[PDB]
Amino acid sequence: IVEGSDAEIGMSPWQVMLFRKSPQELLCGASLISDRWVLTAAHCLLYPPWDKNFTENDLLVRIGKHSRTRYERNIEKISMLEKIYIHPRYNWRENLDRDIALMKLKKPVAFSDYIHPVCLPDRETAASLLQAGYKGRVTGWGNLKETGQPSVLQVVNLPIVERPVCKDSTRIRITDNMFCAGYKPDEGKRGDACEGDSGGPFVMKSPFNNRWYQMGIVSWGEGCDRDGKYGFYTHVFRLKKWIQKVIDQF
């Protein structure tokens, strides 16, 4: 996260850290959507261009964290993966279309003051809040500057941007399963996600029932916090049907 700030305790109880067994390192962010399922970006697990292809036994899940490098004894919870599910039509070859993946934990996690699941949007909520100008919140332990890393979870609030503007800021072919967010050059404020934040949740707070909903997933960008450029996120609602399918069948 660039131009963000330290999160307060319990601010994002659904934030998940994808941790590599060996070598032990931060791999990606993710989000807790229930006591047995974790949502993240597909490119965190599969991306041939970089020879990236992880399996269940290469990773660990760390929930309830605040500090990036410390083993938060009695606070965080480390879980193992039972099975991974990459969207069947994940386009890693061209534009990262449908950059989403579900992960099944071996054992259910117990909720606490620091561990709690985020909500998934329904048609109505997506419709009401997914509008340009409306701000969302992104969290991660990623780079603070374009390339130097944070000591603790970072957070930043960013406005959704009109589809046309998003399309005109890049050569990459944009699809309906994406949206971009960030401030325009003439808006004074700034901020963005960056390498290391991948798979992180883009959340909004519903003014109707006061709940937090995950609308996006940190998918891709071109540079970090550059003028005229915006962060792209996987449009979670569009892929909601796939999500439900996997969960109802496994």
Partner: peptide, 28 residues
């Protein structure tokens, strides 16, 4: 069930430092 309701905030009716910025941006 009770997704999206944070134990240290919504549950105790306490707000975080910048959540208002989000709600203020949701023009009716």
């Amino acid at each position: 069930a009770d997704c999206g309701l944070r134990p240290l905030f919504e549950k105790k009716s306490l707000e975080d430092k910048t959540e208002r910025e989000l709600l203020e941006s949701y023009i009716d």
